[PDB]
Nucleic acid binder design. Structure first.
Ligand SMILES: [Cl-]
Ligand SMILES: [Cl-]
Ligand SMILES: [K+]
Ligand SMILES: [K+]
Length: 367
RNA sequence: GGUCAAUUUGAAACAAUACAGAGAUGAUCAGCAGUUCCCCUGCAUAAGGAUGAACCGUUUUACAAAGAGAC
């Protein structure tokens, strides 16, 4: 659990003159110690400015705090540790942006100093944010107003940040190594009570899940998932791998997680030579590793005016600082190509191209 | 047609979308090992050091069917 604690390195400066931007907060405080990052924000009535400064070390911060109550051309500033001012927020809509979060707070009259979103490099689905406000009391006010708020059909979660209090995820059985997947069952074997009787001896079973539609399209091979109450039981159930059940040699293994599956689907595309498949897709690059496929979807629909039905899938390729958009057909993909190349996304200009173009652009970013 | 196979198919990824920062990761983008070059200490083609970058190996791998290509 021990990693870092920003309240030892990060200070809050209150009452800076309206002229003070990032650049010149930097210049004022950089003698205090080396600085990693500065953010600046207007007060509610635009009468003064707040700054948030992350120092490289706690002693840079303590040095900054020695300037509390000093005068910066006209104004008596206050410099303190930024402590108890961090919120954590999740279950906002998939396409919600840093700006949207900032307007959310602004509509309740709360200044936001910093809003930090996670890298999607290793998991495309991550969706949460940390948000620093200017007082403990604002933080409490945000929870009271925003926790439980319905936004575009999503019930928001907003809390005072405390990672030690985090909750169990609804899919944590799989992360703990407690869920097995059973493969190559026949339709005759794809029956809950049948699997239950055959696996109960390994340990107590918590859940059995059978993906729908396997009998109904009568598959040759069917699959199922089973969650045990503890790890050891599931590990014992792996002895059933390569064993006889009815007329089948079945397979049994610990279920994989979505990020692992999704990454391998991307790799398959990145190695395809099936030009049929490749004619249907285009890449956008370069993109921040914070940008999700939902945000890209929303861009495509709201700003480029594409219909949702024309878009089959959107996948991240953060190792080349891009994304892949698979369209309904190649003719549509070819028009979109010209339209998207040079378009604006998140206030910067993006490009579109084939996979190879995305690589060339990335390799050349390396040089 | 014997030995290596990029890959394809059987074939279905459930379980609540979110659910704790680059504070994240499973070779998921890894570990280990090697080669060349880049960067700082030096008269330097002597010896150290930290980064990189381009490469080369090796470790790993449910089952069945089919298979560009490669001895
Ligand atoms: Cl810190
Ligand atoms: Cl925290
Ligand atoms: K903290
Ligand atoms: K390797």
């Amino acid at each position: 659990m021990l990693t870092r604690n920003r309240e030892l390195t990060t200070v809050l400066v209150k009452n800076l003159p309206k002229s003070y931007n990032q650049n010149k907060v930097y210049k004022y405080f950089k003698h205090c110690g080396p600085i990693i990052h500065v953010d600046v924000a207007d007060s509610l009535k635009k009468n003064f400015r707040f700054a948030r400064i992350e120092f490289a070390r706690y002693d840079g911060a303590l040095a900054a705090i020695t300037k509390t109550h000093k005068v910066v051309g006209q104004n008596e500033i206050i410099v303190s540790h930024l402590t108890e001012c961090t919120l954590w927020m999740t279950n906002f809509p998939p396409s919600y942006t840093q700006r949207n979060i900032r307007d959310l707070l602004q509509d309740i009259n709360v200044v936001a100093l910093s809003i930090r979103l996670p890298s999607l490099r290793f998991n495309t689905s991550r969706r949460f944010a940390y948000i620093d406000v200017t007082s403990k009391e604002d933080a409490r006010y945000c929870v009271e107003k925003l926790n439980g708020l319905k936004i575009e059909g999503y019930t928001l979660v907003t809390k005072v940040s405390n990672p030690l209090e985090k909750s169990k995820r609804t899919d944590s059985a799989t992360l703990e190594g407690r869920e097995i997947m059973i493969r190559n069952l026949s339709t005759e074997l794809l029956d809950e009570n049948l699997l239950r009787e055959s696996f109960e001896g390994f340990g107590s079973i918590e859940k059995i899940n059978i993906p729908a539609g396997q009998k109904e399209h009568s598959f040759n091979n069917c699959c199922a998932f089973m969650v045990f109450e503890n790890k050891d039981s599931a590990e014992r159930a792996l002895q059933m791998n390569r064993s006889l059940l009815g007329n089948r040699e079945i397979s049994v293994s610990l279920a994989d997680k979505k990020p692992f599956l999704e990454r391998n689907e991307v790799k398959r595309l990145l190695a395809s030579r099936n030009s049929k498949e490749l004619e249907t897709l285009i890449c956008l690059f370069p993109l921040s590793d914070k940008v999700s496929p939902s945000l890209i979807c929303q861009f495509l629909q709201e700003e480029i005016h594409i219909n949702e039905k024309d878009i089959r899938k959107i996948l991240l390729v953060s190792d080349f600082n891009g994304a892949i958009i698979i369209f309904r057909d190649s003719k549509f993909a070819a028009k979109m190509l010209m339209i998207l190349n040079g378009s604006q996304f998140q206030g910067k200009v993006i490009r579109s191209g084939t996979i190879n173009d995305m690589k060339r652009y990335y390799n050349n970013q390396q040089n």
